[PDB]
Design a protein around this ligand. Structure first.
Ligand SMILES: [Ca+2]
Ligand SMILES: [Ca+2]
Ligand SMILES: [Ca+2]
Ligand SMILES: [Ca+2]
Lengths: 92, 92
């Protein structure tokens, strides 16, 4: 038995490991694998090419242009804060 | 239109603001709000009291004994790496 939150974490592992196998290492999202993933995973219109390549420059820790899981946790942090800050303007 | 990952992050924001609202300040998980949240989010059974008291003490960068949102992303990081390391014994 496993929660809808363990299934949420599993989905984050799913789109990560699945798209992380598009290129580079199978544990990294290259700047192409990440651009591929964001362009499917975040549907909200402004996921445009310079929005993603400047985001990428801030998600990455070293400019290797391969996103390791601890680089990728920066993405997950900002997105989980942004949906909270949305909820603070909607449920009020 | 918003993805199953945005709905996974929404689930995380929903459990978060609910338990992060349940003691101390409302954007922050106290040693009790966290011990609640973990034992609600993780069905594992090794989410035991001293495992959680070390985990809390290991999450709490600042020793204030609430978990701010940027403390809480460290929990989500360890879990997204642990379910990947699970997935690496199956989808090898
Ligand atoms: Ca890759
Ligand atoms: Ca990198
Ligand atoms: Ca609190
Ligand atoms: Ca703290």
């Amino acid at each position: 038995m496993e929660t809808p939150l363990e299934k949420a974490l599993t989905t984050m592992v799913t789109t990560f490991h699945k798209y992380s196998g598009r290129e580079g290492s199978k544990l990294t999202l290259s700047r192409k694998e990440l651009k591929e993933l964001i362009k499917k995973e975040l549907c909200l219109g402004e996921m445009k090419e310079s929005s993603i390549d400047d985001l990428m420059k801030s998600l990455d820790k070293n400019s290797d242009q391969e996103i390791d899981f601890k680089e990728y946790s920066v993405f997950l942090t900002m997105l989980c804060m942004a949906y909270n800050d949305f909820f603070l303007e909607d449920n009020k």
